[PDB]
Copies of this chain bind each other. A is one copy, B any other.
C-alpha cells in the first residue's frame, strides 16, 4: 500500500543522504558540515576506506576548494566520490586489493 519501494539508485542516494543529513545538522546550518562535523563522519562510520583519521585537514583542503570552512552539500558530496573510487581503486599502485 504505502511506503512504496523506489529504484535501487533512489534507495542508495537516500541512505547516504539521510546519513549525511544526520551529521549536517550537528552545528550551524543543516546542510553544511563544518570542520568538526566533517571529521565526525570519517572518525565514526569510516575506519577502513579512509583510515586516515588524523589528516582530515588534507581531505578538507582537497574538498573545500574555496576554503570557506563549510563543505556545502555539493562540496561534501565530493567525499562520496573519493569513497566510491577508493572501494575499487583503493591503492591500485601498491595494494592490491581487496
Contacts and interface: CB of A to CB of B under 8 A. Distances in A.
Interface of A: 7-13, 15-16, 19, 45-46, 48-49, 73-74, 77, 80-81, 83-85, 87-89
Main secondary structure of the interface of A (DSSP, over half): helix
A15 B8 contact: yes
A12 B12 contact: yes
The copy count of this chain in the complex is 2
A94 to B, nearest CB: 14
B81 A81 contact: yes
Contacts of A74: 85, 88-89
A10 B46 CA distance: 11
9 contacts: A9-B19, A9-B49, A11-B12, A12-B12, A12-B16, A13-B84, A13-B87, A74-B85, A74-B89
B16 A8 contact: yes
Contacts of A89: 74
